[model samples]
Target: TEVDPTHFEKRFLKRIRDLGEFGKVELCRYDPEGDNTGEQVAVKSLKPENHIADLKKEIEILRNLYHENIVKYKGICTEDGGNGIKLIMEFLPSGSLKEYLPKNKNKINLKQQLKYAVQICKGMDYLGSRQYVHRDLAARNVLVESEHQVKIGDFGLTKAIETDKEYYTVKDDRDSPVFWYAPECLMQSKFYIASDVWSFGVTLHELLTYCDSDSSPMALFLKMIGPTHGQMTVTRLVNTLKEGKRLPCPPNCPDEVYQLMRKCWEFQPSNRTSFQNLIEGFEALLK
Candidate 1:
């Protein structure tokens, strides 16, 4: 069902305010009953008419996912008209990595941030192993429940077994938030697991800049994104990869991490590094 923006906003706000803590958007908090986990639950809803179709599309992926780095799908409700199609998911009070980065701003310690980042890689690696491509990976899609824990959310979800009968969306001239998107996504109008890795690189930029979207390296880096059209791109990806910057990461905010991010941003998908190698290098950081 197509949803009217006004109704969606009103219903979303109402449910979120009633059961959530951090307003009605991003990943929210909720309380269902006596055996509740406080505000550590997610509330996903769609207006009545569109709920089932949109939900089934989303559920196609949710029903097949399983990983510690992924959100736990609790259940769905379609009892209350347009607002009834709600999805209960695991909620992290620390909110999104985007919130944390901006809230503390430049004050966030580098070492501390790197630790969280390593965990982000850990989570991404988990998804990679599962062949789950988070097409819309971003700091906002990342949730931090604690200092050392992180989980990825949002974006198209697909069940690998259904790969043959899988999903597809026609190329439409809709404006995607160009900032967080990868180059290939723009050019091909298609997203795959590798592009997900590319988004991880952009995510690193935001992670480093705390989603400021207006800083130096980040701003400069983001400029290189989009379909550079094979035109002379300005990003340091070419420079970053040569440094063997992809392995045995630095203690925190290492040049290698930037290299790794660059590798994730490879212009050609085949040139990109796999999550297997990334996991190997990142696990060493934790060690």
Candidate 2:
């Protein structure tokens, strides 16, 4: 429902040096009461040696976004620069989807996996409607709770559009987590909500694959849009997805779920199903 009585405030003021290069989180001793929380909330201590100011900027961004699938920001602490800046956000217990992949091997049962995939699609669809792009949407970034209440986390790379500054997607490519990035993000310097959609397609594959230990999903990405697959560019891959050429649901997968994934991966950004349409598609699957 919420947080332990003092847990929220305690974590908000806790101190630390850095998040490690990967981001350090204060691991709380589990109390059955707060144990059910999700990974959405991480008590991260900020170090001057790290980058508190920049992280604060990140905090400002998260506060503006409130979606069912996105992490919620409760509060943040600036006084602990001497200790380590602590941030209070939502709590998510499932950890990164990456942590779950290996436990199940590289395969997922059909029904449950689709349930999660549909949730992801709904999240993406809602964020796109807000005109804000999640720049980084991946399995490791999405957190699952007790009933598989999945909430997308990690807004470190997010860019908000509060200004007319050249479209965020049109700039020379900025740095990001390399693993789940759509090839186009790595190659070109122009994209849109469609760019987010491309990343979602990969995230969908991740849910379907159970885990990415061997990186076959990346290979699936490669095969569907690799150089040999046709020069292997984002536009090409996005096109193939739109044309139903690449990343079609593996045979025997649920008929409609796979169909929706195909729609998200389409190449021509405009031709692709709208996020609004995507939301409706997933809602239809709820029954």
Candidate 3:
């Protein structure tokens, strides 16, 4: 059901923050059932004026996915007297897991890093249980809930797996997020849950080293596009991955976790670690 614009205003007071491709994020307030609520809740405005297609699927996915480690969807607002196709979600005041990665001024310690990593595993576990593949699993796509808790967000590239043997063959379009891709996906345009597992290992490296150089390969790869970086540099990077260049383990990372990362980075999709294994591994580590 659609929300009326007049009710949205009378129901809540609001503020806005820009989230680039996702458009402006809003902080809102409300008084419901004799209880007062505040901007701790968030909303994102998807303007048709921007010429973006009406993302009916985005709304569909958010509405269906419900997990503690996944961003909660509240509801939607449309242009018909509402916040212009707005998608309401849980407000994550602490921002993204990317900001908490090592070497940053806001870096969390090793214990905290492990804590966040395990939470991500739990989220991925839940997603896999539902037979979906999060093509864009990375530190930046994770939203920090209060304190150490985090929730996976940004589902733009996610796809559903219909059967146990499913693998979506993607077209190698210019818009692909290559740095996070596994060798198979990068070289062949193939995608599946195992491909996402490879990205998780990359995200784990981000947590361990606070270095996106190897962790956020996507960002570095982005820099190499167009005339900015040598064409040879891009070719070398892809070839390096095809030859098995994973994000190197940082100094002092736990051996067991490093071992887990290696499993995730295995070249073959079937050889990669499943989130179920990760959930069990992290559970044991926490214990």
Candidate 4:
């Protein structure tokens, strides 16, 4: 059976406020036939200029993913006479970890940070088991469900891999989260499960620093690499990373946690710790 084109817009009431940068994400109320229960959902409406294929791919990838630390995916809808698409997903009130961390930085402690780290490790471990690589794993992509919980969201850069193949090489020069990319990814355009581990290390740094803008992964990376004349080129980044330079430990970050981050940032992708091992390491820290 074909889904009605106007099904979502008619059923959900969209609020005026925008949530994030990519598209128009509004808090919507889901009102089903004659009922007024007013269940809230996130309506992520893509603009006409956005890449439809990527959105479609994200939708397909998100459809089968089911985990406690992963965001829930609902259905999708069309808008603007089928020229635009809207993705309906579970609405997380606390917003992204990027936004949440700063506000609660003063209140958050090491244990809370470890909890978030473990949850993300669990989520990434699940993704690795499912043969998916989240190319853009970072604090901004993690959604806070509540004070005690978070879930990995934003499947925009996620890709599935075959069992036989260990890495996926990019064919296009599309914009990527370069700061969170592994050395192999930045140098050779290849992304493995271990590449995602490198990104997890950056995300862990973000969590430890409470996502402070001054000490952000990019900011610190640039500072470490020195100033650039024109634009920062990938060649320069690759050269610097090749020289064994890595992001410094966030202020007061624990030695154990910092060591784990270093493990993720190993020069050799094969040497990086696996997500399963990361989960075990973080869980041990929690106790």
Q: Which residue window of length 10 is worst by lDDT in model 1? A: 5-14
Residue 74 error for model 3, in Å?
1.0
Off by over 4 Å in 2: 1-41, 45-53, 80-84, 101-109, 162-166, 170-174, 177-187, 222-245
Which candidate model has the greater lDDT, 1 or 4?
4
In the range 185-256, model 2's lDDT, one tens digit per residue, is 555655467778767767877777665655546566565566464333555655554454555465455778
Q: What is the overall TM-score of model 1 with all chains considered together?
A: 0.68
TM-score per model over all chains? 0.68, 0.69, 0.79, 0.89
Q: CA lDDT, every prediction?
A: 0.56, 0.61, 0.70, 0.82
The total number of steric clashes, by the backbone 3 Å criterion, in model 4 comes to: 0
Every model: Cα RMSD to truth: 7.9, 6.2, 4.6, 3.0
Model 1 regions more than 4 Å off: 1-40, 47-51, 80-84, 105-108, 156-175, 216-253
- Best candidate according to TM-score: 4
Please give the distance, in angstroms, between residue 247's alpha carbon in candidate 3 and its true position after superposition: 1.4
Per residue, candidate 4 scores C-alpha lDDT tens digits across 1-287 of 99653356644564646666545567777776546677677777666455777777887788788999999987787665767666778889889988999999888899998988989989899988888888989998899998899999788778888679998877754678888888788778898999999999999999998998998988887777765733656667778888898888889987999998999999898899988888889888888
How would you encode candidate 1's per-residue C-alpha lDDT over 1-287 as one tens digit per residue?
88432122222222333222201233443433434453444666553333355465575566466777776676554544544355556667777786767787556676666666666677777765665555667787788767666787663433232264221232542535444445555555555667667777777767776666455333454354433534334233343333333222223466866777778867667787776677676556656
* Inter-residue clash pairs, candidate 1: 1-50, 48-82, 61-157
